[PDB]
Design a binder for these strands. Structure first.
Lengths: 143, 124, 177, 173, 35
RNA sequence: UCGCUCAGUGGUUAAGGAUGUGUCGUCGCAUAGACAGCCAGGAGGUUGGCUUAGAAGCAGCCACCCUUCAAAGAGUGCGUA
């Protein structure tokens, strides 16, 4: 923390970086992990065994590591009442994929800690399509 | 791929024709009976289908006329033999007319490819 | 057509079928003009003319108070042409009218430094030249792009001052020695 | 949008910008002309859609429509076409077109843009007018639907030709 | 190479008035053709 | 009177072309004195689901909802596993 920071974005999985296959010492040599993976997304990242968890991962001239991350449950409460199966094929082909009618309430009712907006008719407009990539039908729309 | 037999014959003569129609999208017409070697128009659609799409069908307004009779060349001082050439010949008829959009006439761009003469695209 | 410009009251132009030239702080620009095009001075400022309609004053005019710049550089304006270089060192002296340029082969190839662009030298890392020609300002800048052509890799020799020119690539990238 | 002109010959009918023109109104034949600037306002947006006037050199005022379209064979210099004018008591020729418009829901199995290359429709129209309002080309291209010519959104009334069953747009991706 | 009607190709390609050319000069850096 | 005018074609020659040119119709507009040559804005849910090493704006299939704010593109082209 001399007098400048870095940048860079990464899609840190469920914490896989200890054995070899994943990306352990393959992503740590310029100041990433090496000897610390726990208590750094394994810290308060154990509320579940399969999420996402975003963060901007600071990388300084030193190697100690602690915390400083985003708020992941922002993008998870809409990612565990579904899954990875017959969801993402080729959107636009028939009538495939569905969630739930009532599950179009607390599935936009999660934009406040991270979404820089978070308001009425604002804390559900950005996230009003998350499974848009799966190309399915609303059936409800955040009322 | 035209007739299947029904005797040889035919003669020559150039001018124009009669086979022009008000197109619904983006027409295209010949302009006099230019040059298309049959085994040229035998590379008219495939060349217009390098990979325009997986599927896709439009409309044309012509069909192979032909035979010519060329004969060998051991000593040309005789009658005839048989066709062994083939040709279409036309006027100013339609032959393409796209129905998409952004593509416009991409396949009416390399149509002029196999075209020693002038064959505009126009539109309607 | 133009006319406006930037210059105080310290210069005078002729009025003789094309003979003109500047006369400020070192100039005497070569003028030579036709016969259908001339114009005469009108004071500290200038004017525009059209002694004949059509294509007769838009090939040799409509940009006459422009070439003035070719002479402005020196009579009041500045001149500099400053570049850098990375193709094996940056050394160049004149001691007269014959820069040596230290690069590559013992096989000379020396060029002949003209009058006005004859070099000064001071800083070696990046030669400085008082090119008061504006004829051989960018040409001399180009005098090193016909032979010693810069490497098509890193960002060497030919460079203006700081652009998104970047250094050429290929397959990937690496360098050592 | 004026008139005048006269020439009973194909002289000023083959001289740079002009046309030939035809007229046969009730006691009103002759072959006029007129220039050819914004003389391609037929099939654009005026295809029978609406009917202004013209102010011909001297007498009367006849609205009329467009009388189909035609442009020019091969080139693009519309050689003389035609021009209807409502003032007769029995000709034919109606201009009720059938287009192709949209994203083409053909990528359901295999099929491109609504083709069609014809220039003729099962139509009829009693008097002589040819309104402007009709679709036919869309309607879920698949199977168990289709949409061609036989009845449709049909001008005004019924139809009369010979055998009502042409082809036109159809589907078959 | 090639001496006939071959069109502009990329408007960035100025036509050039010379002896009787048509020219074509890409959009940046790639091809500098001329007849 | 005067244009294409400048290639020496006119005195053996063409499919395809080059923003050369006398001249007829529209357009978003510099009687908001626009764009075409800049200063400052250059980031959030989501850094999208999916082939899952990450593919995270760019090895892939598909897809385009809102945000600080009076607006701003599911990302053209650069670096690139």
């Amino acid at each position: 923390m001399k007098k400048v920071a870095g940048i860079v974005k990464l899609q840190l999985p469920a914490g896989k970086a200890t054995p070899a296959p994943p990306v352990g010492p393959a992503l740590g040599q310029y100041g990433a992990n090496i000897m610390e993976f726990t208590k750094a997304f394994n810290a308060q990242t154990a509320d579940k065994g399969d999420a996402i968890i975003p963060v901007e991962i600071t990388i300084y001239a030193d190697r100690s590591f602690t915390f400083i991350t985003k708020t992941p449950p922002m993008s998870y409460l809409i990612r565990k009442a579904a899954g990875i199966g017959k969801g993402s094929s080729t959107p636009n082909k028939a009538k495939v994929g569905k969630l739930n009618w009532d599950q179009v309430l607390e599935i936009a009712k999660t934009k406040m800690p991270d979404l820089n907006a978070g308001s009425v008719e604002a804390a559900a407009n950005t996230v009003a399509g998350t499974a848009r990539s799966m190309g399915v039908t609303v059936e409800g729309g955040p009322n | 791929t035209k007739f299947r037999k029904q005797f040889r014959g035919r003669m020559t003569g150039d001018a124009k024709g009669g086979d022009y129609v008000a197109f619904g999208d983006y027409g295209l017409i010949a302009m006099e009976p230019a040059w298309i070697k049959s085994n040229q128009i035998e590379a008219c659609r495939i060349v217009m289908s390098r990979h325009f799409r997986r599927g896709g069908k439009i409309y044309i307004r012509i069909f192979p006329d032909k035979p010519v009779t060329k004969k060998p060349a051991e000593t040309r001082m005789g009658k005839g033999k048989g066709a062994v050439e083939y040709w279409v010949s036309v006027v100013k008829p339609g032959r393409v007319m796209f129905e998409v959009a952004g593509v416009t006439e991409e396949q009416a761009k390399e149509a002029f490819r196999l075209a020693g003469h002038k064959l505009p695209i126009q539109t309607k | 057509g133009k006319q406006p410009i930037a210059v105080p009251s310290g210069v005078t132009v002729n009025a003789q079928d094309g003979v003109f030239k500047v006369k400020g702080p070192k100039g005497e620009l070569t003028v030579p003009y036709n016969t259908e095009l001339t114009v005469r001075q009108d004071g500290d400022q200038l004017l525009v003319e059209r002694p004949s309609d059509a294509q007769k004053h838009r090939a040799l005019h409509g940009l006459t108070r422009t070439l003035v710049a070719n002479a402005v550089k020196g009579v009041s304006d500045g001149y500099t042409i400053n570049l850098e270089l990375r193709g094996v060192g940056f050394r160049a002296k004149l001691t007269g009218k014959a820069l040596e340029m230290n690069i590559g082969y013992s096989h000379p190839v020396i060029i002949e430094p003209p009058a006005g662009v004859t070099f000064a030298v001071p800083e070696p890392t990046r030669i400085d030249v008082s090119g008061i020609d504006k004829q051989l300002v960018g040409q001399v800048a180009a005098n090193v792009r016909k032979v010693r052509k810069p490497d098509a890799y890193h960002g060497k020799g030919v460079r203006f001052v700081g652009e998104q020119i970047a250094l050429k690539a290929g397959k990937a990238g690496a360098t050592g020695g | 949008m004026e008139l005048t002109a006269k020439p009973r010959t194909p002289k000023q009918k083959l001289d740079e910008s002009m046309i030939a023109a035809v007229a046969y109104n009730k006691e009103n034949n002759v072959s006029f002309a007129l220039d050819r600037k914004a003389f391609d306002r037929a099939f654009r947006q005026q295809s029978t859609t609406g009917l202004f006037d013209i102010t011909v050199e001297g007498g009367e005022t006849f609205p009329a429509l467009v009388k189909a379209v035609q442009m020019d064979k091969r080139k693009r210099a519309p050689i003389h076409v035609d021009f209807y004018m409502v003032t007769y008591g029995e000709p034919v020729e109606v201009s009720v077109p059938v287009h192709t418009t949209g994203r083409s829901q053909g990528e359901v199995q295999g099929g491109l843009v609504d083709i069609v290359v014809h220039n003729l429709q099962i139509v009829a129209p009693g008097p002589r007018r040819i309104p402007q309002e009709l679709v036919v080309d869309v309607t879920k291209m698949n199977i168990g639907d289709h949409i061609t010519a036989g009845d449709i959104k049909l001008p005004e009334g019924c139809t009369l030709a010979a055998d009502p069953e042409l082809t036109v747009v159809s589907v078959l991706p | 190479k090639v001496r006939s009607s071959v069109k502009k190709m990329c408007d960035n390609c100025k036509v050039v008035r010379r002896h009787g050319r048509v020219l074509v000069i890409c959009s940046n850096v790639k091809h500098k053709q001329r007849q």
